[PDB]
Amino acid sequence: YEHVRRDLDPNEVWEIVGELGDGAFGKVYKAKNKETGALAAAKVIEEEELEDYIVEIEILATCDHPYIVKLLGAYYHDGKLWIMIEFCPGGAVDAIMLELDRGLTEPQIQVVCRQMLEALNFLHSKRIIHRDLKAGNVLMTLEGDIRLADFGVSAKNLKTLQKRDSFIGTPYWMAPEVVMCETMKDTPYDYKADIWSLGITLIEMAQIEPPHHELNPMRVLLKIAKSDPPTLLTPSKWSVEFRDFLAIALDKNPETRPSAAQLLEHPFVSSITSNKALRELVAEAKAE
Numbered sequence: 001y002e003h004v005r006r007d008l009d010p011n012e013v014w015e016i017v018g019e020l021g022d023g024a025f026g027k028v029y030k031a032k033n034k035e036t037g038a039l040a041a042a043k044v045i046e047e048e049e050l051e052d053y054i055v056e057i058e059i060l061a062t063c064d065h066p067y068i069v070k071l072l073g074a075y076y077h078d079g080k081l082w083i084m085i086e087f088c089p090g091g092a093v094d095a096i097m098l099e100l101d102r103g104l105t106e107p108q109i110q111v112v113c114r115q116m117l118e119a120l121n122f123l124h125s126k127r128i129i130h131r132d133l134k135a136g137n138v139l140m141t142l143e144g145d146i147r148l149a150d151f152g153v154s155a156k157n158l159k160t161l162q163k164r165d166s167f168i169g170t171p172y173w174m175a176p177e178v179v180m181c182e183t184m185k186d187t188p189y190d191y192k193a194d195i196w197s198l199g200i201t202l203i204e205m206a207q208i209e210p211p212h213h214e215l216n217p218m219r220v221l222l223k224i225a226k227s228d229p230p231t232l233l234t235p236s237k238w239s240v241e242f243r244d245f246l247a248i249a250l251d252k253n254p255e256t257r258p259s260a261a262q263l264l265e266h267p268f269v270s271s272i273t274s275n276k277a278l279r280e281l282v283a284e285a286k287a288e
């Protein structure tokens with residue numbers, strides 16, 4: 001009830017004008033304010049079902065942090081659920097890498113890492129786990145800041161996803177302790193799963209693709225569980241600080257794995273006080 005209206009027909013304010021891409025629960029649309037020309041991202045999802053999607057709305061409604069996409073409004077009108085979300089004009093980091101046909105520089109990765117850790121430290125304070133970190137779910141502003149989007153869905157919506165034969169892709173970023181899991185238990189170290197995913201996200205940004213990228217998807221699950229933690233392919237190309245950060249983050253034991261707060265003290269990120277590296281990257285991509 002709290003964050004979803006049944007009164008205003010969205011079409012009065014918002015026009016669906018395009019597609020931005022595909023998330024974990026289908027299409028993400030571009031929406032335009034008809035009077036001002038101001039932009040939003042949007043879900044438009046065709047009473048049982050209405051209740052199930054609300055869990056996802058409550059996550060964005062609950063977060064007041066710059067590095068998590070804002071909820072602008074939610075409407076139920078004519079059998080459709082509209083979720084209006086902050087538009088990130090820089091787009092997804094994996095799209096930037098596709099557009100420029102290369103990985104991020106270390107300074108670019110350091111800005112992304114610093115901001116992702118601040119977001120994750122905030123999320124742990126709310127006892128919210130993202131559950132699906134990857135470069136495709138890290139969005140950019142033109143000013144050069146990140147926004148996390150596409151929070152991992154509920155048990156109910158994963159059920160509806162499988163019953164309608166939709167994917168969310170091979171889980172290359174998944175922590176070893178939960179790679180065989182359809183749904184995860186509530187545990188004291190559940191939230192540590194995002195720290196592993198952050199480590200894999202950094203490697204994906206360094207090398208364009210995550211580890212085990214071409215393995216059979218069932219073999220990926222086994223490799224994540226069984227393999228030594230992944231390292232950068234060419235360690236000589238990256239600072240000792242980057243490699244050390246990855247080595248402490250990609251701990252297969254979720255108890256000993258550091259928290260976001262602990263990793264914010266690491267020299268790889270503790271002195272990152274400018275987003276300029278990322279501002280310039282987004283400027284490069286917007287040119288292409």
Ligand SMILES: Cc1cc(Cl)ccc1CNC(=O)Nc1ccc2cc1OCCOCCNc1ccn3ncc-2c3n1
Nearest residue numbers: 020021022023025028041053056087088091092149150
């Ligand atoms: C809310 C909700 C409800 C239900 Cl019931 C189920 C799941 C979810 C969670 N899904 C999202 O938060 N998706 C999302 C929400 C917003 C955006 C992107 C999103 O995903 C990733 C899509 O791929 C990237 C496509 N390029 C861009 C470019 C700019 N921008 N600016 C915002 C988003 C975005 N996407």
Ligand SMILES: [Cl-]
Nearest residue numbers: 023024025026
């Ligand atoms: Cl989505």
